[PDB]
Amino acid sequence: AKKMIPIDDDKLIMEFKDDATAFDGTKKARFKGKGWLNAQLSVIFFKLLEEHGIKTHFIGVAGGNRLIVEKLDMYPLEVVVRNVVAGSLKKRLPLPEGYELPEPIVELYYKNDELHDPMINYYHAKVLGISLDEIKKIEEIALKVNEILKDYLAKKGIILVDFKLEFGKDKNGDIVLADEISPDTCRFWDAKTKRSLDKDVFRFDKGDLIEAYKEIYERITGEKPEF
Amino acid sequence: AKKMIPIDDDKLIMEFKDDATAFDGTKKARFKGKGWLNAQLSVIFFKLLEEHGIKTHFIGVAGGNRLIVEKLDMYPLEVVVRNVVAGSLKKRLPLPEGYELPEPIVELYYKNDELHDPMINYYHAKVLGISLDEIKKIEEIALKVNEILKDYLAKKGIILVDFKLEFGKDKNGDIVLADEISPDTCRFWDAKTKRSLDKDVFRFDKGDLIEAYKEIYERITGEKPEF
């Protein structure tokens, strides 16, 4: 759904594709316009976060589905922040889908396809070569990002249910937000109806993906999607 | 605007009045229904906060403009939390009115009429007999309260611009949220128009106070004010 194209030692192109994949590629489909929507939503979110002084890999746009991003020494992590009980959290806590958490939960996953992205804790993270100090910074950033996105979206009648972030290290040694921020990598629910406006629509055939993703875009920008 | 009536060693009545005062009582007016609205908005806010496990002095209602509250050993503080630049903050930061702060600011004021509520820091607070540990707890509670109120109001198209909290100590030695939480003690702006829906309307004759306060009530409860 994304292709990384190197430019040089300090930057690269992140290209967003219309291809969608779930359940280890056993489920595949192409959604005309998905790439554009995810790229554009990523821009909006990265820029919103940067306004608050969050460091992100975003540099500029290089076309509708193409972002220029700074090259990083990437942490082998998926960092997940959860506000509302959904998906895999139902397997860890005796709480129903939709349950509003008293505080946001941060989970750490070892980014590794062969092991199917297993959950880790701070000890495992050290073995993987990530210091406790780094993990503390990463979680602090993640929670700050969580609050900005959650509040921004809440004003637009969208629940930030949960989402995945990735991080890397820049030349200075600063920790920098990377990958993407889109309905591919977040759970968004309509505040009134609780319907999914994200990749779960595709994962579980709950409706029309392109329609859900256009909805998010329209609510954020006020504009019907261009392309 | 409030009268404290002692009952006994552990509780008292906080009575909300229709009288309004600004600029050290040099500016005065009576707004029919103001007391009821502030009393009722206080109930709503205290209960909302208690649902999140914030300890407050609120015990019960004893009439439209009367609350039963627990007797506390009061800290001589006004604790102000600020999300958006307004009022006196324009005298401290080179930032325009309406500027959205990256993070909430907590200011401490020594509650003292003669000295006109001067700003203090942690060192002054110690001389006034408040330990650094207490101040830390107070500020932690204040920021938690800020987040709950801000998010709750934002969903209703109301910007929590800033607000004043007061705190006391109960029998157990726990730190308890006290005084009131109303358009008298908060800055609320309409999200779309940025107009004041609070005591600033009276302070600076920017419109109809009772109209602004009813607006807050209506938006929160969905009901036009009873009395």
Ligand SMILES: Nc1nc2c(ncn2[C@@H]2O[C@H](COP(=O)(O)O)[C@@H](O)[C@H]2O)c(=O)[nH]1
């Ligand atoms: N696109 C994508 N999103 C993920 C991945 N892992 C977790 N997430 C996101 O993180 C959240 C939690 O996922 P869960 O662990 O409940 O399946 C969801 O918003 C989900 O979309 C992944 O490998 N790819």
Ligand SMILES: Nc1nc2c(ncn2[C@@H]2O[C@H](COP(=O)(O)O)[C@@H](O)[C@H]2O)c(=O)[nH]1
């Ligand atoms: N009613 C009232 N509100 C106050 C007082 N002190 C601070 N506040 C509130 O706290 C915020 C900050 O006030 P400022 O420092 O800008 O005068 C405003 O919302 C203001 O109404 C006070 O003594 N009385």
